[PDB]
RNA sequence: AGCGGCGAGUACACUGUACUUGCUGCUUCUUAGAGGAACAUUGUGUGUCUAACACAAGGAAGUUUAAGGCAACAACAGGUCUGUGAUGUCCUUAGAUGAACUAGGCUGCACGCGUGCUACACUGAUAUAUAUAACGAGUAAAAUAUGCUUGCAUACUUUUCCUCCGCCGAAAGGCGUAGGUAAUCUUUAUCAAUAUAUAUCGUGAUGGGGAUAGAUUAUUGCAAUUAUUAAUCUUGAACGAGGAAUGCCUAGUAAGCAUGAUUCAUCAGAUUGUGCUGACUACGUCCCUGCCCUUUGUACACA
């Protein structure tokens, strides 16, 4: 039916923990050719999780200094990035995407005494950590942010040490070994 | 014969007229293809998959679209054509399939038949923002 | 003198007789000070 | 092929062929560009396949280009009020002629010269 | 790629039905071949827009500007130099002071319109004070549109 | 360099000058300016060439220098010059 | 810093990874074989 | 025949006054005109002195226009208006033919 | 403001179409006169079955549909007598403490703090254009002729707002006119920017980015020096996301981006409105700060 960037329809997904599934919320109602729909989140507790994870990045990687407030170019960079994922790797860009978002969330953090993370913040910190990997992998890194993305999502989805998010996840888990 | 229908959603108000013919659809002098966003072109295409091009192949729906945001034009035009096809089914062509026509539109969503009333507000006093104050010093 | 039909001198408030804080919106030719208390009688209905 | 060193920096060999002549001076990309178009050098190629022949064409181009078709205003320091009409004099000679200009204001020694001498912006940098 | 399936009944009776930027690109293509017009030798030393602050760097800025201005003529049979200036408005950065939107340069569009008048594709008239296409212009641009339509359809 | 400027008419002297003086002169000269000129010429003819001309009373900052009245000191000791005329007077108290 | 050169799966990114080239000359080699960014065939 | 005022009830009553005479006299009368209202608004600071928080007030004037036409005698319509118009309302007259 | 309809078509389809002229079959459409509709609304739940609160639903409208203003009692020895011919008391006027005129100052600067304005790029630097809305706002002087000898006096239109157009000038700007005291002319079948898709570059203190210059050209005002404003060329400081500290902020809002209006002859980098893109997460807490209530202890009452 629909086609993400006229290419993808994500008709097969991974099981993951089956809990992040409701948070990632990939379904027909959230199906769209490109992100940056008119979706609204300011009424309840679900529809922020209802919003597709693709939008959850096109709106979250956006912040860096002057580069703030440019979102059409965020859709641009994600559209190109999805190209490079399935090109440098033989798997579905959105499938390795789901893999990365699933295995890029901190399983616990003390934050005042360790405490488990709800799936909402599991997805949240995964997105945040990969996007702040993107910013410092686009600053002073020779390579452009697009190929930086193509490197970081595979690094986080295959458990490769090069991803910033996984190092930060290990640091965040390490606090448990000292408190709990 | 001839029915004139309107669509009000966000800034843009679309006007269309369903007329007798073979399926001639016109968007100003443009067609449904050169507005630019192929993403919203298929958003407007969704009803044509819901109903079918075969039925559109026997009536003409002229459109004038003017002013407003890019999203609002498409969102107004889908409602305008839906109201037009509903009026034609009620008046001239056929009622029983109109019953199911409403049902198949509503099954996809309620957003097509009626849009949203979300709109911006009068910015408030205190600073540049509506709800943001000038930085304070002590 | 050095008069001309230009600048802040050629016009002033018509009650305080001062050139400071004069508003000419719709050529009202009044100062904000006295205007803020004439606003209701003139018709300026503080609404929203 | 690449890396040619001349009176102005031309290390930008891996860079573009036109930028090979626009980075030498006049970062404003206007004097450099008018010199480029008067020298008739395409931009599709890169600076690694440039010719000393084209460079010599340029060293004839920038020689008092008032003789060329360029207008009066576009050229830097158009009037510089004196018995004639002076010119943009690029790189070391640029520094020399604007040195002549900065010494000639010592006789002026008016408010603006005294201020720029004592270390104040000619318009006020407003350290207030 | 730029094509998508068309199940609705079309007309293809004019140029507004066909693409705009690629149509003016193909018009520039035919314009190189037939070369009824000049470059001219006057546009090369003045930037397109006041706030552009860059040279155009295309060797075709004038060539596509004429094409676009013709497309604007086709769309609006009543336009003026102010209209084209506004249509070509661009940002301008004033250094330490904020950006501001400012119009284009009048003389470039004035020369383009005078060249169009010499070409006779457009004309003036008191009634319909803006620029109005001649009927010969209509037929030429319409057969041009049909040629453009067919060369991409089949 | 200087004699042609001394004898040259205002209409082309102002073309030698810059448009900031051009607009001023083509738009107005005002009566005080002509009084000051007809008086400084009197002072220039009366005074000896062995010493500089005396300053001008009733000080003002908008007496354009036109190179046919070079020599004066002012009532601020920067002598007006052929490179200096198109700059207005200034010469004020910015005491530091 | 830059050290890649035009000297020596037509995907721009993959070929750039394979041959350590600039992106302009990577699209140049793409043209050299086939004959902003595009959707792939 | 157009009317000017600021408070809508004045125009409403003096407009209800309009068509009754036309119905009585069976004239060739054109239809009414219902223009969007104009809003005149200004902003001004409170606090005569500069001390304290800076606070301002916003004002508003609603301005109401309608236009009518009648193929009726100018003097008779002028009088049948002047009989029942308020000085707080302004009127202009013009005629039609068919 | 239109919708038609036909009146002739300019090019195509074939048994209506974009561009045009003109009026009238007609007013949901462009709109406002008017009221209505939202009422824990219906059922499935929590609650002493009371006050209240939940889900689902119709519905544009379910957090009072959101957002705008009005602010009781009492107080501050808060600000203002520099707003007033609102005002007491004291104080002063020809060598004014009244008015005008010349010039100057609040733009001057080791520094510090605000409000802000402009980068640290490739999520970007750059050239082309389509799809772009709203609040907006807008009318006692020119010049000519004569007389005296460019200036003075006297006579005739109205320039003295925004401007559209057609010209000239790279531009700034200059010229002569259409419209309009205004849903009618700027302008509105359309005014900015973040755009757009492909094109130059492809993070190399880089071409990023602009603190910084002299040279000037036109406008503004009689006067621009203290480079008011402004077009070009030359400029190349800091800047690798940030000391101790600290501000504001939950929905078409923050932020980014512009832009209207005021003060206006000229000048936002100020203030007040409007719109576009519609971000990360909270159906919360009393930890800090600061309030409200109850009890309690006071040797405090200027608390």
TrEMBL record, chain A:
Keywords: Ribonucleoprotein, Ribosomal protein. The keyword Ribosomal protein applies. GO terms for cellular component: cytosolic small ribosomal subunit; ribosome. Transmembrane segments: none annotated. SUPFAM superfamilies: Ribosomal protein S7. One of its GO terms (biological process) is translation. PROSITE patterns: RIBOSOMAL_S7. InterPro entries: Ribosomal_uS7, Ribosomal_uS7_CS, Ribosomal_uS7_dom, Ribosomal_uS7_dom_sf, Ribosomal_uS7_euk/arc. GO terms for molecular function: mRNA binding; rRNA binding; structural constituent of ribosome. It holds the Pfam family Ribosomal_S7. Residues 32-180 form the Small ribosomal subunit protein uS7 domain. PANTHER family: RIBOSOMAL PROTEIN S7. Belongs to the universal ribosomal protein uS7 family. This is 40S ribosomal protein S5, putative.
Automatic annotation (TrEMBL), chain E:
The keyword Protein biosynthesis does not apply. InterPro entries: Ribosomal_eS19 (IPR001266), Ribosomal_eS19_CS (IPR018277), WH-like_DNA-bd_sf (IPR036388), WH_DNA-bd_sf (IPR036390). GO terms for cellular component: cytosolic small ribosomal subunit. It holds the Pfam family Ribosomal_S19e. SMART domains: Ribosomal_S19e (SM01413). PROSITE patterns: RIBOSOMAL_S19E. Keywords: Ribonucleoprotein, Ribosomal protein. One of its GO terms (molecular function) is RNA binding. One of its GO terms (biological process) is ribosomal small subunit assembly. Belongs to the eukaryotic ribosomal protein eS19 family. This is 40S ribosomal protein S19.
Automatic annotation (TrEMBL), chain F:
GO terms for biological process: translation. It comes from Plasmodium falciparum (isolate 3D7). One of its GO terms (molecular function) is RNA binding. Keywords: Ribonucleoprotein, Ribosomal protein. It comes from the Eukaryota. GO terms for cellular component: cytosolic small ribosomal subunit. Belongs to the universal ribosomal protein uS19 family. Transmembrane segments: none annotated. The keyword Ribonucleoprotein applies. The chain holds residues 21 to 123 of 145 of the full protein. This is 40S ribosomal protein S19.
UniProtKB/TrEMBL annotation, chain G:
GO terms for cellular component: cytosolic small ribosomal subunit. One of its GO terms (biological process) is translation. Keywords: Ribonucleoprotein, Ribosomal protein. GO terms for molecular function: structural constituent of ribosome. The keyword Ribonucleoprotein applies. Belongs to the eukaryotic ribosomal protein eS25 family. This is 40S ribosomal protein S25. The lineage of its organism: Eukaryota, Sar, Alveolata, Apicomplexa, Aconoidasida.
């Amino acid at each position: 039916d629909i086609k993400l960037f006229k290419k993808w329809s994500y008709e097969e997904i991974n099981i993951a923990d089956l809990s992040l599934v409701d948070c990632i919320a990939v379904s027909q109602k959230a199906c769209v050719y490109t992100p940056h729909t008119a979706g609204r989140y300011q009424k309840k507790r679900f529809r922020k999780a209802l919003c597709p994870i693709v939008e959850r990045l096109v709106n979250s990687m956006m912040m860096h200094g002057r580069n703030n407030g440019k979102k059409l170019k965020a859709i641009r960079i994600v559209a190109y990035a999805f190209e490079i994922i399935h090109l440098m790797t033989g798997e579905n860009p959105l499938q390795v995407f789901v893999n990365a978002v699933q295995k890029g969330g901190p399983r616990e953090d003390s934050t005042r005494q360790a405490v488990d993370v709800s799936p909402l913040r599991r997805v949240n910190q995964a997105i945040y950590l990969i996007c702040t990997g993107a910013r410092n992998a686009a600053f002073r890194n020779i390579k452009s942010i697009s190929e930086c993305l193509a490197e970081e999502i595979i690094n986080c989805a295959n458990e490769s040490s090069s991803s910033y998010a996984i190092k930060k996840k290990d640091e965040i888990e390490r606090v448990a070994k000292a408190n709990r | 014969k001839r029915v004139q229908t309107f669509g009000k959603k966000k800034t843009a108000v679309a006007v269309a007229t369903v007329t007798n013919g073979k399926g001639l659809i016109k968007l100003n002098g443009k067609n449904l293809d050169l507005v630019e966003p192929y993403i919203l072109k298929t958003k407007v295409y969704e009803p044509l998959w819901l109903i079918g091009s075969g039925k559109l192949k026997n009536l003409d729906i002229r459109i004038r679209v003017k002013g407003g945001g890019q999203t609002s034009q498409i969102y107004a035009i889908r409602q305008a054509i839906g109201k037009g096809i509903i009026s034609y089914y009620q008046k001239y062509v056929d009622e029983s399939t109109k019953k199911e026509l409403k049902d198949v539109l509503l099954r996809y969503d309620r957003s097509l038949l009626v849009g949203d009333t979300r709109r911006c507000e009068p910015k408030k006093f205190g600073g540049k923002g509506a709800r943001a104050r000038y930085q304070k010093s002590y | 003198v050095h008069p001309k039909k230009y600048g802040q001198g050629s016009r002033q408030c018509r009650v305080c007789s001062n050139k400071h804080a004069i508003i000419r919106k719709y050529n009202i030719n009044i100062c904000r000070q006295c205007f803020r208390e004439r606003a209701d009688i003139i018709g300026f209905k503080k609404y929203r | 092929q690449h890396i040619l060193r001349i009176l102005n920096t031309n290390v930008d060999g891996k860079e573009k062929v036109i930028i090979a002549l626009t980075a030498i001076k006049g970062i404003g990309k206007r004097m450099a560009t008018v010199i480029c178009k008067q020298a008739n050098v395409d931009p599709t190629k890169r600076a690694g396949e440039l010719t000393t022949e084209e460079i010599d064409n340029i060293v004839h181009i920038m020689s008092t280009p008032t003789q060329f078709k360029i207008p009066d205003w576009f050229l830097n320091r158009r009037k510089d009020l004196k018995e004639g009409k002076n010119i943009h004099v690029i790189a070391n000679q640029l520094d020399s002629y604007l040195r002549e200009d900065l010494e000639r204001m010592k006789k002026i020694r008016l408010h603006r010269g005294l201020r720029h001498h004592w270390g104040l912006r000619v318009r006020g940098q407003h350290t207030k | 790629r730029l094509l998508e399936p068309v199940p609705f009944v079309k007309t293809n009776n004019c140029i507004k039905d066909v693409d705009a930027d690629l149509f003016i690109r193909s018009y520039a293509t035919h314009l190189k071949l037939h070369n009824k017009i000049t470059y001219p030798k006057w546009c090369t030393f003045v930037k397109t827009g006041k706030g552009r602050k860059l040279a155009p760097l295309n060797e075709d800025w004038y060539f596509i500007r004429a094409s676009s201005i013709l497309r604007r003529l086709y769309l609006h049979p009543d336009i003026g130099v102010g209209f084209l200036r506004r249509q070509f408005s661009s940002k301008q950065r004033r250094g330490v002071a904020p950006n501001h939107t400012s119009l284009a340069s009048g003389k470039i569009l004035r020369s383009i319109l005078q060249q169009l008048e010499n070409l006779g594709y457009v004309e003036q008239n008191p009634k319909k004070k803006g620029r109005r296409l001649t009927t010969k212009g209509e037929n030429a641009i319409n057969n041009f549109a049909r040629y453009i339509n067919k060369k991409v359809y089949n | 360099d200087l004699d042609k400027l001394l004898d040259l008419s205002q209409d082309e002297l102002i073309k030698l000058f810059k448009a900031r003086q051009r607009r001023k002169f083509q738009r107005g000269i005002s009566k005080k300016a002509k009084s000051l000129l007809k008086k400084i010429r009197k002072s220039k003819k009366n005074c000896e060439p062995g010493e500089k001309p005396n300053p001008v009373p009733t000080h003002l900052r908008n007496m354009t220098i036109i190179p046919e009245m070079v020599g004066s000191i002012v009532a601020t000791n920067v002598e007006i010059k052929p490179e200096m005329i198109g700059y207005y007077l200034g010469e004020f108290s910015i005491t530091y | 810093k830059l050290n890649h050169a035009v000297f020596i799966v037509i995907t721009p990114s993959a070929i750039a990874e394979k041959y350590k080239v600039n992106l302009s000359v990577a699209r140049a080699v793409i043209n050299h074989l086939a004959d902003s960014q595009k959707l792939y065939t | 025949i157009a009317l000017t005022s600021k408070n809508l009830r004045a125009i409403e009553k003096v407009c209800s006054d309009i068509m009754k005479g036309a119905k009585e006299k069976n004239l060739n009368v054109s239809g009414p005109v219902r223009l969007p209202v104009k809003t005149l608004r200004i902003t001004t600071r409170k606090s005569p002195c500069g001390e304290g928080t800076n606070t301002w007030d916003r004002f508003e004037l609603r301005i109401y226009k309608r236009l009518i036409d009648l193929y009726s005698q100018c003097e008779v319509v002028t009088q049948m208006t002047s009989i029942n118009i308020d000085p707080v309302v302004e009127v202009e007259v013009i005629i039609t033919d068919s």
